[PDB]
From a paper:
Meanwhile, the AAV1 and AAV5 particles alone were treated under identical conditions to obtain the unbound structures to identify potential conformational shifts upon receptor binding. The cryo-EM micrographs indicate the presence of AAVR on the AAV1 and AAV5 capsids, but at distinct positions. The final resolutions of the cryo-EM reconstruction were estimated by the FSC 0.143 cutoff to be 3.07 Å for AAV1 alone, 3.30 Å for the AAV1-AAVR complex, 3.18 Å for AAV5 alone, and 3.18 Å for the AAV5-AAVR complex. The binding of PKD2 to the AAV1 capsid resulted in a conformational change at the βGH9-ɑGH10 loop, which is the counterpart of the βGH2-βGH3 loop of AAV2 and has conformational movement upon AAVR binding. The counterpart of the AAV2 βBC1-βC loop in AAV1, which underwent a significant shift in the AAVR-bound AAV2 state, shows no obvious structural shift compared with the location of this loop in the unbound AAV1 structure. Notably, in the third region, two arginine residues in AAV2, AAV2R585 and AAV2R588, directly bind with HSPG or its analogs, but the corresponding residues in AAV1 and AAV5 are serine, threonine, or asparagine residues, which do not have long side chains with positive charges. This may explain why HSPG binding plays a dominant role in AAV2 entry, but not in AAV1/4/5/6 entry.
Numbering used by the authors:
A (entry chain A), E (entry chain A): 219 to 426
B (entry chain A): 219 to 736
C (entry chain A): 427 to 529
D (entry chain A): 427 to 633
Amino acid sequence: DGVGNASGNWHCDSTWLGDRVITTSTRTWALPTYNNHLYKQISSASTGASNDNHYFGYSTPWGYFDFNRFHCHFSPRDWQRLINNNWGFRPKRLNFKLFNIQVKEVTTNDGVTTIANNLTSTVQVFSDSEYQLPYVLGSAHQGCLPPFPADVFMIPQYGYLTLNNGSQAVGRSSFYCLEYFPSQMLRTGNNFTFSYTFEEVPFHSSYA
Amino acid sequence: DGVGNASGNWHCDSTWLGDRVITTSTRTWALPTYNNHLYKQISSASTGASNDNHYFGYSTPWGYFDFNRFHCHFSPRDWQRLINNNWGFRPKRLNFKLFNIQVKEVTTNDGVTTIANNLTSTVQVFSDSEYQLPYVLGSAHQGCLPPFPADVFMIPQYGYLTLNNGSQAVGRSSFYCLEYFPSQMLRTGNNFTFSYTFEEVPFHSSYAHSQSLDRLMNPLIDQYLYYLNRTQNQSGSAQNKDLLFSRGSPAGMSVQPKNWLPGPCYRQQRVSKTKTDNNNSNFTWTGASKYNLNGRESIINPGTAMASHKDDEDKFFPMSGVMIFGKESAGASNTALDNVMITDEEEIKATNPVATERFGTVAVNFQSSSTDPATGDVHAMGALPGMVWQDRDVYLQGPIWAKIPHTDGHFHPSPLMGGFGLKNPPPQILIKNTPVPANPPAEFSATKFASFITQYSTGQVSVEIEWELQKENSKRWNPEVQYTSNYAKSANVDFTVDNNGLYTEPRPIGTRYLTRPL
Amino acid sequence: HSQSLDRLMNPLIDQYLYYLNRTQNQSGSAQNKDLLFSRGSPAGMSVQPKNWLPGPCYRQQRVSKTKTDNNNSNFTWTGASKYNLNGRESIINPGTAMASHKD
Amino acid sequence: HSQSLDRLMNPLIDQYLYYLNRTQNQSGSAQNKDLLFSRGSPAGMSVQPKNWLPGPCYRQQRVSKTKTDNNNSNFTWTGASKYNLNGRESIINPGTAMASHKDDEDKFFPMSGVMIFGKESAGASNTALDNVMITDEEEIKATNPVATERFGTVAVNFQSSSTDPATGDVHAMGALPGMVWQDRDVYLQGPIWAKIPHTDGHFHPSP
Amino acid sequence: DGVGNASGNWHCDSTWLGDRVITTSTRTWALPTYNNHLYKQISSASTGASNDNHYFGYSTPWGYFDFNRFHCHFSPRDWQRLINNNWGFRPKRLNFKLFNIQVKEVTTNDGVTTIANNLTSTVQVFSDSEYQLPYVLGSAHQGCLPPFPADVFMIPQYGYLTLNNGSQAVGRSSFYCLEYFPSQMLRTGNNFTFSYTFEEVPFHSSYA
């Protein structure tokens, strides 16, 4: 509980139990300000695209965490110790944690830009556990956790697409204001945790 | 519990209890950012080295704490109060603590670089208590705690070596990411503590022997065992070959039947401390005792614990058979003799051979009426049964422990630098600054980060080892040899600071001062 | 082992122990015999003070698997390492556990 | 021991391990260098793969009990195995527990490798052979080397198409792993115990 | 318990009880950095002195508190109310306290030297209650508490003398590293207190 007190430790171990493996993975992140806090609507009119590449959507000032690659959780050794003596695997439950938050204010003055430290600024975090936003994950995008644990990554920008009569909207094109979701404002001494349990999915056939 | 609250006190006392001494030692440390947070791989390709000096490894952004010298825990007074009235010592348990952490961010602006104070930045500390990283400690490196408690030191950089086909890797060369270890992120109000218990190691022999190994007999009484004395008569008429046996022998002690043997040997070379009493060559690689491991050579250095020189022949030292420490104003390459501290290892002359001379001679052939009996010269000698020795002396400057390598076999696991061989040594405590990046751009880019905030941390660190003493039980009459300071009109007191605050150690202090019979 | 015995050091940090480096000066005027000690040595690892020793030895003889890279003799009894027990000999075979060949 | 150390095998059954047998063909046409391996070997027991080693060694010198079968010298200090402790020498005497002599070669004793007791009417200096009792230590010949002869030979150099394979002669041998031995025999006249010296290290503390 | 919380009050009263007087006295102090953190050894070689004024010693980066003058505890009125109607006095017990610690970092830049405030820097304080350092007090030196309570004083530098064969040391000249004493590192929210009881000393004859 900050200021001079850390709100979480670096857990990045991987305990192989008997008929299960628990993989933990901590990363350092960085989140800029996107769109200068605006809900800019994006489309394909300004681009001059083909008929196939037209889109209509909305870009948000919100970031999103994605850990949807296998090297975000498995080292190359733990992958080898997985693929070579197992006929299958599936995830049972995850456990997310967001901690040691540092909000930094930057101020430009003749290219001698100093970075100071806002102790009172907050960060809004919510997990959409009711699946009522467009699920942009599961689309093989960049901006995951890095493969190597000693890398600092940059959080992507959340932006969704909806229905499009070409490069124009249809009356059923949805619009989502994400400040109409209950967030958790996290000042520098606070942390975000939630837990998730995967439903019954079949084992991946890790065999020929 | 910070910010405005200290998370530990300065403990640097040394309580001498009855059959034990507890030494505490706090130091102020400083930790930079190494490799700019990168895992740079290091090898010998860019260096242009010889075949012997090739390596392949990995340097890390992690630091490590090392307190593997005896002056990190003992003052010169507590060392004197240890070596002079104890026949042994060994460590029982240590107790590590890391406290009062201050992470400072530095910012350059036209050489008017200001240092500010990150209250929210963290520091990752873990102790590898399962010994699954390469144990770079136990290698006599710099960057320990300083000898003098009022010095601020800089934490070294952790970097390991692995298998190398020359300057290239082999498929079995391991790679260790140290962020794949559970750390403890320490913001400025937090502290790191752990405790360690040493396993059963034998006491260090902090004594000399008061009696030689070849002089363990009664000088007044002869024996019942005989030896062959003459193979030729003194009748002087001719070659009168006759086997003459003799009861033996108070008047000749070199020819009595003995019962034990002096220790192993591996000869070094005479280097006198007078330059004129040396061969005009170099002679420090071509004529040095060296071992061959995977086609490349390495000087033994020091090797087998042996006596440095013969009696009243104090000027010769074995070429690589002694620990050589350094005084200040010594360079890192080709320093003069006046800047080093060459240790002598002549208190173990009673059991151990001279390092610079053979362990005796053996027979070569079969003597007959024609073939005169030729002998050879044993230079290296392994372990025979019935063989006793003493290990290498520890010093106030020198190392405390080392890790016994995890091998299927090992003979007498005492390190050749002296100290305590430990299968499970004190674990490596590794520490780094958490990377706090600078401003990311407005749009997304997955080429991760080259722009960090240039920062460093400082703090205090206190190590507390408890040592089990072994009291003398001596029934010696006359006074024994002590470590005294020369009471004379001196310009500078030994083991104190100078006119401008440089702490110097004028000579190496061993621990073999008391005596006991063999 | 993932690590050699003569390579158990930190390749980044030097030591506090010194070794004799030169027994002759580089002044090149004459036979300038002088004992030059050196702090040692991240850049030379063969000359650092070590702490352990490699195991025992009892040498065998080079037999290549290519017949042309061998001596034209036999050489399998006359030039083999053997022990003498009660006046009669016997090849060690295998003997001391040692590496078969160099890198 | 009722069985030698180099004879611990089944004399009826061969092995699955092979050894290099010939480095040259019997075709006799030329220098036909060829590596011939052979399954081995009930008919040759000196070349089988063994599993242990005979004990340590430190050679003594042949002194026969017949005066004529000796060198005409003295030869009892100049040609004796001795150790060097603090610049001064001392004969080992007896030293490493080793066999006194080879089979059916009972007249040679090692110069200082045997316990030599005394009968009565023996003097204290330069007594004759008829007044002493030289012990024999040949019952440990099964595990221990002969005191008066090498513990085998080792290689010296690298054999090639030019350098013929030279061997050396091991005279003193320390402790290798995989090495067994028997200690020196006790006698009715000889000592019972001794004190192990109070040292930091000592190898196999038998006197 | 700091930062924004004072760790002691200003007590400077003087209660005259019946057969005793309790004098309290608070002062503001200032402690520089001496010797640039070094144990500089001092002697009389560089001075060029007489035989009588030779010395050999050691100066330390440590300060010391001294309150060994009578006006550090008595006002001129309380002294008059002591000397005029008492045939004697002696001290029974003292009670020391060190509080409201402020560590200030100064930074020079073209003579526009700013003084900032280290919230995390510590101050090491110990009382040598076993008398195993050279007792430089009881020598009538400067650097006590000031007589007047509204003065800020500067803590002296600790430095001792030992045995001297002229301007050189003798083998029995002691050397004392003061970081070989258990200190109490005091960050800005911490305080130092200890208590002392005087042994039986005779009353001072405050009479003619």
